[PDB]
Design a protein around this ligand. Structure first.
Ligand SMILES: OC[C@H]1O[C@@H](O[C@H]2[C@H](O)[C@@H](O)[C@@H](O)O[C@@H]2CO)[C@H](O)[C@@H](O)[C@H]1O
Ligand code: NA
Length: 144
């Protein structure tokens, strides 16, 4: 019961880009809320610094997976895929993703359940200053 043809909220169409004020720093929180499309294949949340993706968070409904990675100078590193339980996103279902930036890693929770910790690979946190949300979701709220 959610499809890409539904009218987005003002300024919340996808792909969505917004600034992270002051860039990342230890204790900085980001919250992204929305609904996965009923026919979703994948979507991604990217914390970007210049031409690189410091943190790529990629729920995949075709693979029943949540892929995490970093892209540096247009190349991908090794993927992290471990999950504590089942696939925390579902087609047609609302989600709230909380990303916590600590000094050494990201902590990521979905609907209040921790799903992964991701060690910082790009450590210049204040340059990680752009958030992108793209793919098969409708967005309802973003706080950075
Ligand atoms: O790792 C993030 C990127 O993965 C790309 O696909 C990978 C794939 O997951 C992996 O199994 C292997 O085959 O290499 C592919 C190319 O890196 C996605 O295409 C890309 O969008 C990112 O999600
Ligand atoms: Na799509």
């Amino acid at each position: 019961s959610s499809f890409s043809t539904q009218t987005p909220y003002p300024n919340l169409a996808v792909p969505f880009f917004t600034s992270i004020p002051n860039g990342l720093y230890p204790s900085k929180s980001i919250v992204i809320s929305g609904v996965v499309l009923s026919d979703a294949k994948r979507f991604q949340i990217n914390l970007r610094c210049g031409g690189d993706i410091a943190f790529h968070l990629n729920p995949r409904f075709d693979e029943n997976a949540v892929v995490r990675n970093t892209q540096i100078n247009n190349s991908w590193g090794p993927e992290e895929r471990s999950l504590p339980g089942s696939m925390p996103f579902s087609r047609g279902q609302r989600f709230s993703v909380w990303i916590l930036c600590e000094g050494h890693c990201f902590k990521v929770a979905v609907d209040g359940q921790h799903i992964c910790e991701y060690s910082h690979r790009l450590m210049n946190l204040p340059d990680i200053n752009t958030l992108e949300v793209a793919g098969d979701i409708q967005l309802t709220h973003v706080e950075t």
